[PDB]
């Protein structure tokens, strides 16, 4: 929101000083401020149920002028338990005189998506027939590869044994979505003597990135699986002839590949 | 009664898989703690030199 | 048969404990990595 601040560089000592005096036009909120020492941090005066705090606190940072506008200030004031957000590039500022101004940005920058998305599929295993069926049902919250592209997801299913890729399947493409629905069924001939040695690897890829780095994320179930993945595999084996559906969180391709090697 | 020894076999195998997951937790714990001990080696050095540096 | 069910139940208990331990040691890893890279 609205906010008065000061900015000073002391050339004799080689140090930058920013004042965080007053904030105005807030949405009540019990606030506190924090200094962004561009690539330390400062704990400012924490008000309590104050829709317009004051701090008059100065913040000193001993950076040489050879840093020359490379760094950049950022301040994100939080309603204590990030409502206020404003940033200033270190190279937009003339230190011929100290500066004091009102900035009023009341919107922060949305954090990059860390989770890769989730995939739901069913597993069925018929021991007598030695037949394993995977139904890719749906995926959701897929992480976008690049901003400003459009994502065209599809799924690969690999049946592995002893680290060898035995059989490979793929879904159709669903253009322009992060929440594809498939309901596509794939069958594998796996004799019950072998059913316990195999892994089923499930990868979600972006077709628009085919031929470069295109994997969004993956999981595997079966031999050496862990977590919710083993739990789904064991449910399948516990329930012969019956399809069992479960959600899975997608994991980082390089992490899972290290597990599969 | 072949169904019975099939289901028993899949319980044995569930048990082996559960154990393999437990074994991986123990191996990962050991790997992490070892890496952190290299961290602590460094930290203890730095603190010896920052305490003699006063 | 009882042996199998008992042993599975034991393994399940230790897995539950170690899952908590692995969480705690990842916290430990975070704090120590912080103290170190200085």
């Amino acid at each position: 929101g609205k906010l008065q601040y000061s900015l000073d560089y002391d050339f004799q000592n080689n140090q930058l000083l920013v004042g965080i005096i007053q904030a105005a036009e807030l949405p009540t909120s019990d606030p506190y401020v924090k200094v962004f020492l561009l690539p330390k941090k400062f704990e400012t005066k924490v008000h309590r149920k104050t829709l317009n705090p004051v701090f008059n606190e100065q913040f000193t940072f001993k950076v040489p002028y050879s840093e020359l506008g490379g760094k950049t200030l950022v301040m994100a004031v939080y309603d204590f338990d990030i409502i206020g957000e404003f940033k200033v590039p270190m190279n937009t500022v003339d230190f011929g005189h100290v500066t004091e101004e009102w900035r009023d940005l009341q919107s922060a920058e949305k954090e990059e998506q860390e989770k890769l998305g989730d995939i739901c599929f069913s597993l069925r295993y018929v021991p007598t027939a030695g037949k394993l069926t995977v139904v890719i049902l749906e995926a959701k919250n897929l992480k976008k590869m690049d901003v400003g592209g459009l994502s065209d997801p599809y799924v690969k299913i690999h049946l592995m044994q002893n680290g060898k890729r035995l059989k490979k399947k793929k879904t159709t493409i669903k253009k322009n979505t992060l929440n594809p629905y498939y309901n596509e069924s794939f069958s594998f001939e796996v004799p019950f003597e072998q059913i316990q040695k195999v892994q089923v690897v499930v990868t979600v890829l972006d077709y628009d990135k085919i031929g470069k780095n295109d994997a969004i994320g993956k999981v595997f179930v079966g031999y050496n699986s862990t977590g919710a993945e083993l739990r789904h595999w064991s449910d399948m084996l516990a329930n012969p002839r019956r399809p069992i559906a479960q959600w899975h969180t997608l994991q980082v391709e390089e992490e899972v590949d290290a597990m599969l090697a | 009664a072949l169904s019975e020894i099939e289901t028993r076999h899949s319980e044995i195998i569930k048990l082996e898989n559960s154990i393999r997951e437990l074994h991986d937790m123990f191996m990962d714990m050991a790997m992490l703690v070892e890496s952190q001990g290299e961290m602590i080696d460094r930290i203890e050095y730095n603190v010896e030199h920052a305490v003699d540096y006063v | 048969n009882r042996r199998l069910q008992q042993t599975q139940a034991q393994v399940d208990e230790v897995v539950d404990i170690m899952r908590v331990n692995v969480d705690k040691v990842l916290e430990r890893d975070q704090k120590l990595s912080e103290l170190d890279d200085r």
């Binding site: 994991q251 | 992490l32 | 890893d29 890279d37």
Partner: peptide, 25 residues
């Protein structure tokens, strides 16, 4: 540098949590 290996390391960490189904606090 410290940022490349520290971000790489945090990826290793989330790897473990994901693998075992660990939720953060």
């Amino acid at each position: 540098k410290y940022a490349k290996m520290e971000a790489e390391r945090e990826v290793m960490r989330q790897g473990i949590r994901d693998k075992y189904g660990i939720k953060k606090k």
